[PDB]
Amino acid sequence: QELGNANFENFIGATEGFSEIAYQFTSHILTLGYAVMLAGLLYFILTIKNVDKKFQMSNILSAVVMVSAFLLLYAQAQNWTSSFTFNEEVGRYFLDPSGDLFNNGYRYLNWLINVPMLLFQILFVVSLTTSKFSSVRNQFWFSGAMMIITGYIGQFYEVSNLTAFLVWGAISSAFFFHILWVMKKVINEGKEGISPAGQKILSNIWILFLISWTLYPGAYLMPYLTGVDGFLYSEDGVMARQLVYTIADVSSKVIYGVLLGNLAITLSK
Amino acid sequence: QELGNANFENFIGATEGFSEIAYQFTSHILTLGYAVMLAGLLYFILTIKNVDKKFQMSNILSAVVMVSAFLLLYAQAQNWTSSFTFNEEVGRYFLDPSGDLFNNGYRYLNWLINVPMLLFQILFVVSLTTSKFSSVRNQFWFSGAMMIITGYIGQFYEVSNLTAFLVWGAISSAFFFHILWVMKKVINEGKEGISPAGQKILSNIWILFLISWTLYPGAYLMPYLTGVDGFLYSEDGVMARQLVYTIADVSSKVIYGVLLGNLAITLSKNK
Amino acid sequence: QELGNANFENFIGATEGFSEIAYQFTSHILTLGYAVMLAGLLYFILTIKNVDKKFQMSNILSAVVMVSAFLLLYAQAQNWTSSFTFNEEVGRYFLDPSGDLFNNGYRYLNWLINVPMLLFQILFVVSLTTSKFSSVRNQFWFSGAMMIITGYIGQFYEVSNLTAFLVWGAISSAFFFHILWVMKKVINEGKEGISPAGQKILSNIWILFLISWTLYPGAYLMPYLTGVDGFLYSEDGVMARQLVYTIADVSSKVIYGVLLGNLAITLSK
Amino acid sequence: QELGNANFENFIGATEGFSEIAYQFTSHILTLGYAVMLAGLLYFILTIKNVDKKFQMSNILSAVVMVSAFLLLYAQAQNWTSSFTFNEEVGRYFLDPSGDLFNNGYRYLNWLINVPMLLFQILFVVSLTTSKFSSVRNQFWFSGAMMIITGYIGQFYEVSNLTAFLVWGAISSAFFFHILWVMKKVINEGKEGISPAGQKILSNIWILFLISWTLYPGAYLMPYLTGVDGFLYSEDGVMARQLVYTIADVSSKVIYGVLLGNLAITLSK
Amino acid sequence: QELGNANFENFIGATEGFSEIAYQFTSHILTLGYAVMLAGLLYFILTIKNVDKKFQMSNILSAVVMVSAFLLLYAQAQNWTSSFTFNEEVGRYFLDPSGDLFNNGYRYLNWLINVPMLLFQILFVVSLTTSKFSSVRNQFWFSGAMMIITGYIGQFYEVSNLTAFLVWGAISSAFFFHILWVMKKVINEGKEGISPAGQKILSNIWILFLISWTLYPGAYLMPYLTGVDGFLYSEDGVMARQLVYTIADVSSKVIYGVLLGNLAITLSK
Ligand SMILES: *C/C=C(C)/C=C/C=C(C)/C=C/C1=C(C)CCCC1(C)C
Ligand SMILES: *C/C=C(C)/C=C/C=C(C)/C=C/C1=C(C)CCCC1(C)C
Ligand SMILES: *C/C=C(C)/C=C/C=C(C)/C=C/C1=C(C)CCCC1(C)C
Ligand SMILES: *C/C=C(C)/C=C/C=C(C)/C=C/C1=C(C)CCCC1(C)C
Ligand SMILES: *C/C=C(C)/C=C/C=C(C)/C=C/C1=C(C)CCCC1(C)C
Ligand SMILES: CCCCCCCCO[C@@H]1O[C@H](CO)[C@@H](O)[C@H](O)[C@H]1O
Ligand SMILES: CCCCCCCCO[C@@H]1O[C@H](CO)[C@@H](O)[C@H](O)[C@H]1O
Ligand SMILES: CCCCCCCCO[C@@H]1O[C@H](CO)[C@@H](O)[C@H](O)[C@H]1O
Ligand SMILES: CCCCCCCCO[C@@H]1O[C@H](CO)[C@@H](O)[C@H](O)[C@H]1O
Ligand SMILES: CCCCCCCCO[C@@H]1O[C@H](CO)[C@@H](O)[C@H](O)[C@H]1O
Ligand code: NA
Ligand code: NA
Ligand code: NA
Ligand code: NA
Ligand code: NA
């Protein structure tokens, strides 16, 4: 079957199909994804007034991120269920093209909107020392956009053209390392002038940031992390990828937002 | 028909099918489930300001639990209606695979999110004495996650492999007993220093907790509680399970949340 | 056709079918039903602060009842439109089993949730004199549940077994009369100690309560109220039942809630 | 094809069909309808505290009207798109009975709910002089209900029985003229005692009321306003009717609500 | 086949079809569109109280624009997914007429509602000097309506009749130039008497306004901007148009709204 520039989920769906566990787990984990975002939305709105006026923009940005993210993750979950249909005869779920092909692009577009705001929002809680607010913001916004856009292009080729896949991924990675570099600077400068309690939370924010953000490129590469015809080029790789994306998105948005809010409270007088 | 690692609802649906009463009641009770969660959401938001600032995080946690739970229970209800279709010829509802197989996993994922928050939220109303807040929290969160994850794995095998079903269920039970142990400690320490009215509510919270949480393993086992080819391995067992899950979820979240809110009011200087 | 323990709507749908007027009116009236509930939700939230803090729980309870009532009535409306499909050849709507059979149980489960809260909520506005608060509450909650549960069982048999239908209905009625008895007591005791304006509203609340609550058993019996092969065992009876249920639910929840709120305002100082 | 007591939209759909422009425009205008209602809902909620406490019930009533209006108008829009399907062979949209017949009754039921509230709400902004509040309210509510109910019955016969159509329409019109009479009285009495700025707005409210409310009977009659086999008994008449209903509903609810809010501000210390 | 007066998306869909990238990207970008509107809605509501009472109407107008716009863009995204279905044999998405033809009219009707409010809302933040408030408002509202209505008519003919397409587009352009002229006047008069900070933001508002609003006519013409049988008369032109519309709508509403809110803050005592 000709699928063209399609995600590997479709190729697994079109050949081996998905077992009950593989199909149901992916449906469940993706549903958890958007459910957590809407739960987070309520949390962030309800806790806005827990911090001083000057910190509240960060709480507002956390809630705004939850909107977008809930709608895009909900669309991603519907895309998974509509793309794969039970075959009575073999008792597995196969590609149902009439529901459209499955594409991870809904999730990517959530990143496009939300990355700029997640990077931006910490600048409302911490004070920089050396760096100018507008400079850091502009670096975050440019590199954030380019990281997501180049990755979005790459992932269309993850089966149809491994070279394009890896080149676009590599370019994306460059922008990723730039963001990590700037965010480390922001964390360090944020630490000077604030209580030891505040410094501890910023340490935790950095570890959360580093682990959660590194998951994404892992999920990008997931199908190929065990090489050609590896364990992970399979329904097991599909499950692994969608779990990791869901953990990443929950961690990078909700937990991140909670930690920033807790920092804002400690700095609040 | 090969169904593989599927819930027993599908096997009943695929052989005997469901009577009008069995099918409609399950649809109704599952719908009640998500409707109560959204009603609860409004209640908890609207009553935030009925308690002192320091208690209000518990009300917020109750509302956050209602969100997740409404979406997952709504998805669980849609899964039931889509999976079973009326046959004109025999006048019963049979497995319609085109709607996907029915799986209770939507409900389980609601547990994964919400158990950590339900255990956590009492620590914002009561004061511990001897135990450290961070220690109790960490015990709740680790054991809560492991309980739900191991159960989630088990329930895929509830027909296809009785051994896996019962071993994963047993491991889940171990973590369950750990949580009961810690929650008893938390209740006892919570009772010290507070009015007799407050102590009465905490007693009631503990009974509600113990009964409501014990329903879950009952619902897990439901199809087999009358042995091989028993009364409950049937549409009657399907009805029983989905009723018990719905009662449990309403009790463990909404009533629990209401009792905690009533405790918060008694401990409030406004009262 | 084999329909088993199914509501009489399906039997009419399966034999005579529904005319355009019968089908459209039922769809419209059921839609009005859930629309009024969501309108009520907004009204009750927006008017919370029109009464003293000590009355506001009644306003909150009215809003909570609307949320469950809107969701269940909306589901009941979809059940109607999905269950009956236009036949081009005869120009009438017939049972389409693929949409599931039509059952009034969605409405009944709204009663199960909401009856306990409607009875309870008046105890936050009025003061009892002779009766104990916990006793009245317990009587309301026990009898409310038993009334709706026994009715819910009965209505499955409204065609398949007239005897079961009428026995379960009779048991339901007993619990109904108990509730009427207690509510009369509560109204009377509520009247003592309060302004004549407040007493007048409580008089009106009692008339509304008595008429609105009596409609339900009428709607239960509707198909048979003109005997065997009567005018009402027909699309006209289907229309009559769904109108009466909709009027009852609007009256017993929304108008009831408005009157209680107006009482709360008069008692507000 | 026998359609029975069905709206003329179905007869056009079943014979000539609808062009792309006719079908898409109707879908768009009906969508605009419910979108404006939800936009209005937010406006009215957000502006509640712009007026004195004693005027705020009018703002609340405007918001409550929007909730019913959005749900019913949304249902009316879905009824349109579901009822008419593209035919590849002729490139026109034809009646698809599987989606149900199209009926304007969803809109009518929005009137049933909302007319009583729109008439009522002005009595919270203006003071009567000679007329009794309870008398005006009761006249509005009785005549409002009878106007909508009689029209609702009439419109089922707009093709199948022109006599019934026009008699029910005529009866509806009588109640309409009664409402116009009472509302004129209410406007005049409202003008006494208030600033010239307030009087100007009440003049505008009367013109808006008179034009917007007169559109409805025009839309009722639309298909026949060019006589037998006229220009308007056609997809052009369908477009014209649905445009006029949408303009009327937006004017009579949203603009009306805005003008009343502006009056409330004028009368506010 | 016969598509009649239909958008060029359908003609591409009906002949060449859409590749996975072309179809998925359009679905993603249109989804991003409505997601950003709902994220914006939350931002504007949550920041209302950041400005003086007298500026807050502008913040409220930004939120009201977000409602309409979210619903219309959401409908536009659904229209795209239901209109184009995967063909297993060739592995491309082709016109599925059963989902209705695709039409950009949902977006146009969002313009009809929202243009009048976007133009109006700046008059609540700036003070005019020479020009009269009522005159500017009336010019905006008349020309805004005529611009959108004439464009809406034109776009039906964008394949079926190039002459009608370009004449209606030209008339639309005339009203566009009128609006640009008046808005420049409003910006200039707004700048007189206010802080340098205020003047800077108004300069930025003008550049954003000019670029964002100019994108629309570009998107209108997109399929023909590379002439007969050009690169852009293709799935690439479909992608280009829907990207530009989405960027325009986000820029002209959300960014515009943020800048106006920031202006309101600087002018706030
Ligand atoms: C809430 C969403 C967030 C924080 C998203 C983060 C996304 C990334 C850090 C993505 C990184 C990627 C690479 C470094 C290479 C491959 C492509 C990406 C976009 C997945
Ligand atoms: C809000 C939902 C709650 C409180 C969920 C509670 C879930 C349990 C206590 C589950 C217990 C289980 C066992 C002890 C064994 C079998 C598997 C489980 C997960 C059902
Ligand atoms: C908002 C919902 C309310 C107040 C529901 C009330 C329901 C009843 C009073 C039902 C009464 C019934 C009987 C007395 C006999 C037949 C069965 C019932 C449940 C319809
Ligand atoms: C918000 C909705 C409003 C204000 C609805 C108004 C409806 C009317 C004034 C209807 C009038 C009619 C007649 C006078 C004759 C024909 C039937 C009606 C109902 C369309
Ligand atoms: C949020 C929506 C906005 C600001 C919409 C703006 C729309 C335009 C400026 C449209 C302009 C057009 C022309 C000048 C010619 C072709 C037709 C139009 C309507 C696209
Ligand atoms: C950084 C990780 C780089 C991964 C190296 C690319 C491995 C390419 O392996 C690919 O695996 C597929 C499934 O097994 C095969 O179908 C492809 O033919 C093969 O190219
Ligand atoms: C601790 C709970 C008791 C578990 C007892 C497991 C014995 C169940 O036995 C099972 O019953 C099913 C239904 O009748 C049959 O289909 C299976 O063949 C049979 O293995
Ligand atoms: C208190 C009201 C109870 C009245 C019971 C009357 C018995 C109804 O009689 C039933 O009517 C049906 C249709 O008319 C028939 O099909 C049934 O054969 C018949 O049992
Ligand atoms: C405003 C009152 C106008 C009533 C005039 C009714 C005359 C219309 O007459 C009707 O027109 C239909 C379509 O043209 C025909 O199909 C019908 O046969 C005809 O009865
Ligand atoms: C601003 C641009 C003005 C419009 C340019 C006129 C070009 C019209 O060219 C058109 O291009 C289509 C696709 O190539 C062809 O299918 C049409 O038949 C042709 O009329
Ligand atoms: Na599926
Ligand atoms: Na079903
Ligand atoms: Na139907
Ligand atoms: Na259609
Ligand atoms: Na599609």
Residue numbers in the entry:
A (entry chain C), C (entry chain E), D (entry chain A), E (entry chain B): 3 to 271
B (entry chain D): 3 to 273
Give excerpts from the publication:
Microbial rhodopsins (MRs) are transmembrane light-sensitive proteins, found in Archaea, Bacteria, Eukaryota, and also viruses. Despite this paradigm, the first light-driven Na+ pump KR2 was identified in Krokinobacter eikastus in 20132.
To understand better the nature of conformational switches in KR2 and the influence of D116 protonation on the protein conformation, we produced and crystallized KR2-D116N at pH 8.0, which mimics the WT protein with fully protonated D116 and solved its structure in the pentameric form at 2.35 Å. Overall, the structure of D116N is very similar to that of the O-state (RMSD 0.2 Å) and also to the ‘compact’ conformation (RMSD 0.3 Å) of the KR2-WT. It means that the rearrangements on the surface of the KR2 occur not directly in response to the retinal isomerization upon photon absorption, but rather due to the redistribution of charges in the central inner part of the protein protomer.
